[PDB]
Amino acid sequence: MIKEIYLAGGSFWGVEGYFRQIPGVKETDTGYANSDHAETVKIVYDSSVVSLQELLAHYFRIIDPTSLNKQGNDAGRQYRTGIYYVDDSMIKEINSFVKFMQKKYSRPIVVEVEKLKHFILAEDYHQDYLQKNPGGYCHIDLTLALKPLYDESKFKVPSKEELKKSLKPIQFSVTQEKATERPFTSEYDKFDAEGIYVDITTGKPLFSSLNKYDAGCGWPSFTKAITTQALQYLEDKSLGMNRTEVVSKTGGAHLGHVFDDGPADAGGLRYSINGAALRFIPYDKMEKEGYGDYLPYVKPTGNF
Amino acid sequence: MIKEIYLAGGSFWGVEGYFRQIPGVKETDTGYANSDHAETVKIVYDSSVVSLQELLAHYFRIIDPTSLNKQGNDAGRQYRTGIYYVDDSMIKEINSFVKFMQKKYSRPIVVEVEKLKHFILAEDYHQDYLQKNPGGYCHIDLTLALKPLYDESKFKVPSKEELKKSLKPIQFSVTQEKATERPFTSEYDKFDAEGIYVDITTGKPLFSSLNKYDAGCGWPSFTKAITTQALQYLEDKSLGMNRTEVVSKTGGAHLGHVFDDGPADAGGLRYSINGAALRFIPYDKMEKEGYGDYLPYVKPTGN
Numbered sequence A: 001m002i003k004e005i006y007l008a009g010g011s012f013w014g015v016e017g018y019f020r021q022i023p024g025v026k027e028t029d030t031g032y033a034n035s036d037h038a039e040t041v042k043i044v045y046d047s048s049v050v051s052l053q054e055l056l057a058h059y060f061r062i063i064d065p066t067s068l069n070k071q072g073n074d075a076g077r078q079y080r081t082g083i084y085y086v087d088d089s090m091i092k093e094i095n096s097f098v099k100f101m102q103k104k105y106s107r108p109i110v111v112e113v114e115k116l117k118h119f120i121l122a123e124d125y126h127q128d129y130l131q132k133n134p135g136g137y138c139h140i141d142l143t144l145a146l147k148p149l150y151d152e153s154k155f156k157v158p159s160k161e162e163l164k165k166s167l168k169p170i171q172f173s174v175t176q177e178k179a180t181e182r183p184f185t186s187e188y189d190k191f192d193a194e195g196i197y198v199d200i201t202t203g204k205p206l207f208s209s210l211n212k213y214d215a216g217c218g219w220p221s222f223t224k225a226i227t228t229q230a231l232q233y234l235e236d237k238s239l240g241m242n243r244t245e246v247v248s249k250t251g252g253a254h255l256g257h258v259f260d261d262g263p264a265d266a267g268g269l270r271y272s273i274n275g276a277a278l279r280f281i282p283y284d285k286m287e288k289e290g291y292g293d294y295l296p297y298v299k300p301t302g303n304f
Numbered sequence B: 001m002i003k004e005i006y007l008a009g010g011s012f013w014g015v016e017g018y019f020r021q022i023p024g025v026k027e028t029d030t031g032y033a034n035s036d037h038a039e040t041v042k043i044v045y046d047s048s049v050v051s052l053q054e055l056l057a058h059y060f061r062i063i064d065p066t067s068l069n070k071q072g073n074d075a076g077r078q079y080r081t082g083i084y085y086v087d088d089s090m091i092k093e094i095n096s097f098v099k100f101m102q103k104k105y106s107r108p109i110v111v112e113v114e115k116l117k118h119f120i121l122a123e124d125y126h127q128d129y130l131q132k133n134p135g136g137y138c139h140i141d142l143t144l145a146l147k148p149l150y151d152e153s154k155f156k157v158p159s160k161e162e163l164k165k166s167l168k169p170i171q172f173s174v175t176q177e178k179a180t181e182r183p184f185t186s187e188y189d190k191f192d193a194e195g196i197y198v199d200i201t202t203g204k205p206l207f208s209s210l211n212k213y214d215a216g217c218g219w220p221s222f223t224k225a226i227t228t229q230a231l232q233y234l235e236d237k238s239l240g241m242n243r244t245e246v247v248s249k250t251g252g253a254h255l256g257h258v259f260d261d262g263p264a265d266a267g268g269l270r271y272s273i274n275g276a277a278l279r280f281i282p283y284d285k286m287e288k289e290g291y292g293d294y295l296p297y298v299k300p301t302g303n
Helices: A012-019 A052-061 A088-102 A142-146 A160-166 A169-177 A292-298 B012-019 B052-061 B088-102 B142-146 B160-166 B169-177 B292-298
Strands: A002-008 A025-033 A038-046 A082-085 A112-115 A119-121 A195-199 A205-208 A231-236 A243-248 A254-259 A270-273 A278-282 B002-008 B025-033 B038-046 B082-085 B112-115 B119-121 B195-199 B205-208 B231-236 B243-248 B254-259 B270-273 B278-282
Touching (some): A002 A025, A002 A052, A002 B002, A012 A025, A012 A038, A012 A052, A012 A142, A038 A082, A052 A088, A082 A088, A088 A112, A088 A292, A160 A169, A243 A270, B002 B012, B002 B052, B012 B025, B012 B038, B012 B052, B038 B082, B082 B088, B160 B169, B169 B254, B205 B270, B231 B254, B243 B270
Parallel strands (some): A082 A112
Antiparallel strands (some): A025 A119, A195 A278, A231 A243, A243 A254, A254 A270, B002 B038, B002 B082, B025 B038, B025 B119, B195 B278, B231 B243
C-alpha cells in the first residue's frame, strides 16, 4: 500500500536529499510542521518495497536522537527531531521503534512523536534544493543512502571452493548453479515460526517471517524483502518464459524468482525463494547471534 | 492523504486515458485483477484534492453499470465492471455509492464490489497505451474528462447588472469586486448543519458541510472543494503578501483564498471563503432543489 510519514531531522535539504535515494520512496516534500515550526520532509512511500521499519532505521541513522533542538551546527527549535504521523495505525509501530532505539543509547532519546497537526509546504526554492543546487549545504552524507544501512562486515562471501564443501549439494546447486529445489521438499515451505531468513552463503538477512505466506506452490513465499538492500533483480528468460530472477545483492547467490501474483493488499508481489538458499534464525535467538538490529522487521510492535 | 482504488470498466486503455486527466490523480496503472482476471486500472490519488465520491462519479459516468461482462463491443469476463479495494475503510462508502447509483437505473446494477485479491501489472505496452499510440482503440470519449461531471446547464451566469439588483452590497462587493467580509460577521462562520454551499451567483456547488471546520479566523473554512471542477486558483500579490486566490471556475466570482495551514489529516489545506459568496442548501432540501447528484459529498454513507 501507498503510505506517508513525516520526518524532521534538521535542515530538510539533506533529509530530502537522503530519502529521495531510497527505493520505494515515491515522493518527497520539504516543509514546516507543528509559531515554532520544525523543518520536516514529507515521505510518500510504497510499503511493499520499503517498510516503515526501514524508513525509521534510515531516519535514526542520519540524526542524533539525543540532541535537543540542534542537528550538527544547525541549532534552534526549527531543527528539533520528530516523527509525525497522519495514519493512527502507525502509532504503535513508531513508539515501539523509538523504544527499540533507546536500548542503543545511554542518553535519553528526545525525538518527539506527535500526530501531525499542521504541515506548511515550503517554497519551490526549497524543493529538491540539492538537486537544483548540487553545491548546496548538507550536513548529512548523502552517499550513505547508497551504502549499507547495517553492519555488513560479517556478511562477506566465501570463494567458490569453500561453498562447495560447506554447503549440501542442493544448497550449492540452488545458490551457485541457479538450480531449483523440487516443490514441497523444503522444511521452510510449511513453516510460520517468528524470525528472519538469512542468506545461507553470507549470513545477511533477506526475508522476515512477518512477510511470509502460503502461496501453495511448494516454495517459501514472501510479499517483500526485509530491506531494500537485500535483493537484486535480473531479467530471466530461462525455460522459454519471461521471469525476474531474485539474487542476493551482497552474496550474488541465486535465491529464486519474483512474480506479480502475490496478495494484492500486501503489494501483489510473490517472492518465490528456495528454502535451501535460506537459513532460519528464531526471534528468540536473533539478538544472541548478532541480529539485534533486525528485530523490528519481525515484530514491528514488539516489546522493547 | 494519498489513497488508492481499483476500477474495472472495460478496456483499461480508455479507463486510464480518462482518469489520468482528473486532478488529484497521482498515478495510474493498467492490470488484471482477481485464470479469470478483470481488466482493471490502479488509481492512486490525493483525497485532499479529489474525493472517493467524485472518482466513483467519474467511474459510473463512463460505464454501463447494468451490463454484465460487456462494455461497448468488448464482451467477456475480462470486461466485467467492478470496484476493488485494498483499504477496508472504503467498503461502506463504495457500497453506499452503488446503492445511490441504483436509484438512477431501472435495471439492477451488476458492478461487483470485492476486496482486491490479486493485481497483475500489465506490460509497458499497455501502460499509457493511448498516450503512446494516439490512434489506439478507445470506447470512452476522453474529452469528457475535460467536460463537466454534472449538469451545469442550470448554473448560468448573470451579467454584472442583474447581480447588482439581485445581490446585497456585501455579496456583490465580495464576488464581483474581490472584497473581503469582516471576520465573524457571516452566519456561515459559526454554522454546522449538513448540506452543500453553492455559488451565490450561479447556484453551482462549491463546498460540502462535511469538509467544513472552525479555523477560528472568522471566516467559513473548508479542507477541500466539493469537486475538482468547482474552483480555479490565481496568484495574488494583494496587500503586499504571497497568497493564492480562490475563484469559481464556472462563475468567475471571487470566493476567498486557500492557505496551507489547514488540518494536516484532512490534507493541510485551509479554504478561507467569504460567507457572502455562498448560499447554504440543507441536506433535506438538496434533492428537492435539484441537487440530488451531490448527496454523497454530504453523506458518503447511508445512500
